Design a protein around this motif. Structure first.
Motif, PDB file in Angstrom:
ATOM      1  N   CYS A   3       3.883  11.896  -2.636  1.00  0.00           N
ATOM      2  CA  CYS A   3       4.252  10.968  -1.592  1.00  0.00           C
ATOM      3  C   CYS A   3       5.582  10.307  -1.928  1.00  0.00           C
ATOM      4  O   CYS A   3       5.648   9.417  -2.777  1.00  0.00           O
ATOM      5  N   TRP A   9       7.384   8.142  -0.428  1.00  0.00           N
ATOM      6  CA  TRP A   9       7.580   6.994   0.442  1.00  0.00           C
ATOM      7  C   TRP A   9       8.287   5.879  -0.322  1.00  0.00           C
ATOM      8  O   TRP A   9       8.113   5.748  -1.532  1.00  0.00           O
ATOM      9  N   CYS A  38       6.646   3.925  -3.063  1.00  0.00           N
ATOM     10  CA  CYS A  38       5.468   4.687  -3.419  1.00  0.00           C
ATOM     11  C   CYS A  38       5.867   5.863  -4.305  1.00  0.00           C
ATOM     12  O   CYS A  38       7.046   6.036  -4.624  1.00  0.00           O
ATOM     13  N   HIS A  90      -3.823  10.043   2.116  1.00  0.00           N
ATOM     14  CA  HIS A  90      -3.085   8.934   1.550  1.00  0.00           C
ATOM     15  C   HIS A  90      -1.965   8.495   2.490  1.00  0.00           C
ATOM     16  O   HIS A  90      -1.894   7.322   2.856  1.00  0.00           O
ATOM     17  N   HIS A 104       0.464   4.533   5.096  1.00  0.00           N
ATOM     18  CA  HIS A 104       1.824   4.313   5.561  1.00  0.00           C
ATOM     19  C   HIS A 104       1.909   4.601   7.052  1.00  0.00           C
ATOM     20  O   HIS A 104       2.354   3.763   7.837  1.00  0.00           O
TER      21      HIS A 104
HETATM   22 ZN   LIG Z   1       2.350   6.771  -0.475  1.00  0.00          ZN
END
Ligand SMILES: [Zn+2]
Length: 30
Positions: A4, A6, A9, A22, A26
């Motif tokens: 991920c 992000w 993250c 997951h 988000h």
């Molecule tokens: Zn994430």
């Protein structure tokens, strides 16, 4: 693995579909 990328993250999953599970926290539309 599938990670991920992000902002704020950086979690790694062995399944693109727990990754997409997951990505849940988000995402709403996706
Ligand atoms: Zn994430």
């Amino acid at each position: 693995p599938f990670x991920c990328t992000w902002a704020g993250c950086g979690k790694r999953f062995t399944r693109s579909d727990e990754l997409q599970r997951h990505k849940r926290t988000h995402x709403g539309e996706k």
